[PDB]
Design a protein around this ligand. Sequence first.
Ligand code: LIC
Length: 336
Amino acid sequence: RPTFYRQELNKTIWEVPERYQNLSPVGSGAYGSVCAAFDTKTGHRVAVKKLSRPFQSIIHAKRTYRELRLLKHMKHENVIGLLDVFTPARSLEEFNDVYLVTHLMGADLNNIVKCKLTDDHVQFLIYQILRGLKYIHSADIIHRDLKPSNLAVNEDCELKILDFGLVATRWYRAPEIMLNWMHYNQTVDIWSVGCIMAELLTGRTLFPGTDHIDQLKLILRLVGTPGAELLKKISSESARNYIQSLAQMPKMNFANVFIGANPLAVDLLEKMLVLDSDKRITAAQALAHAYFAQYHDPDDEPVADPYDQSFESRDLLIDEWKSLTYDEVISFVPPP
Ligand SMILES: COc1ccc(N(C(=O)NCc2ccccc2Cl)c2ccnc(N[C@@H](C)C(C)(C)O)n2)cc1
């Protein structure tokens, strides 16, 4: 065991190993907060996240466990990974705080007012999203909320997906999680990628809706109302009532919506922005598309080990999720 020290970082206090010096807080959120930090052991800047109230309840306790299990499993260069996880507590008894550490990234994509992006750049960014999405999808994990702010980049344009886990969110959401389903597949994420890609190429949100009705309207004005083939597949009755009650809208030409874009990007966008999930291009398919000629290499677009999500259907006591989380901390094996 190593030695720790205690400081107060602006309300939140923090106890970390002396391995990490130079804690400068980088911002905040409802699930934890982060310090930028210098890691004496490797030279690299790293990012440290203390969970808010990891075991305050059964839902917080189960979510802490999910995040940690999810982070221990991811080993891929386009997906954020676990350098370290630690708690101050020397026993399960005293165990109440969890911290996670990964490499520090310098910016998120949601800042692209200027560097709007060039085509070279769109290609490399989306390519790497698709690459990480392939790996994630391959172990049956779905992100569910991919958006500019969930995608981190360094200055060399190395990209990582942040957590596949748990109005900004609204704008990138597949229209099939909006009108209520509870079976939607991996391709919900390909929709978001399409939406992100639109925006980088254009500088504006393709679908800036004000609510789940308006968002839907924005969407159908581009892809059009569902036809009898997609109506065929809607189990939900209120969904079918709503959509059939709308003035029919035509499928637009994408070549004319994204006018002057690499027409190759346009074709991809067309295969990603399909209303019908079963027909939307996948991550693997999407990386073999001609837009990515320059970056595509099938000897280095790997899949992930089997990942066991059976915990997810489990209903446990707060202290059972807590002990399970502790086991995951205790058994953590770092990387080289
Ligand atoms: C494995 O454990 C980690 C450790 C930290 C992070 N992490 C992060 O959560 N940032 C988003 C965020 C969420 C809630 C409150 C504050 C912030 Cl900045 C990171 C990770 C790497 N780099 C950043 N950079 C920050 C400055 C960002 C995403 C805003 O560019 N954040 C991810 C997982």
